[PDB]
Amino acid sequence: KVFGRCELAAAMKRHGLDNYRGYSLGNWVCAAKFESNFNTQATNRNTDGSTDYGILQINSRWWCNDGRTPGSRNLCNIPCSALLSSDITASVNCAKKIVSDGNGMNAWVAWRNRCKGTDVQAWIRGCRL
């Protein structure tokens, strides 16, 4: 599923990401835009053999099991394929664990390089929330 900008904002709000650990909703929408272009089915392989999955490009090296990342962890206790669903619940719940682990949203390279320090409120401007 390719979300629209305001559609995704509303879904993330319903699932409790607005101001979660202090990060306003626009931060999460911006991260999703540049990680996946709002596409729940996005995948990308990393140099070390791990793979990033879904609208927030969560990494199999630490967070989910895909059966092909030897020596990795599965800290969200989910198969990585569950992060590709049109229902974003699994991605959101895993992202909550990630952002709570001490490094905040700096875990998302695209957030750090393209969202951090910008006017992220523009990502939810005009949306009915």
Q: Which of 108, 127, 126 is nearest to 30 (CA)?
A: 108
Catalytic position from the list 7, 18, 48, 52 = 52
Q: Least distance to Cl ion from the beta carbon of 38, Å? A: 7
Does the protein bind Na ion through residue 72 (CB under 5 A)?
yes
Instruction: Quote the least distance from Cβ 78 to Na ion, whole Å.
Output: 10
Residue 105, amino acid: M
Rounded Cα–Cα distance for residues 1 and 20 (Å)? 24
- Catalytic residue flag (residue 35): yes
Give the total of residues touching Cl ion (CB under 5 A). 8
- Distance (Å, rounded) from C-alpha 59 to C-alpha 74? 10
- Residue 81 found at the interface with Cl ion (CB under 5 A): no
- Give the pair of three-digit tokens for residue 68: 């092909």
Q: Which amino acid is it at 129?
A: L
Choose which of 27, 57, 59, 60 interacts with Na ion (CB under 5 A).
60
Burial of 56 (0-12, 13-18, 19+ CB in 10 A): buried
Assess whether 7 carries a catalytic annotation: no
Q: Binding marks (x or -) toward Cl ion, 30..69, rule CB under 5 A?
A: ---------------------------------------x
The residues annotated as belonging to the active site are 35, 52
Site residues (vs Na ion, CB under 5 A): 60, 65, 69, 72, 74
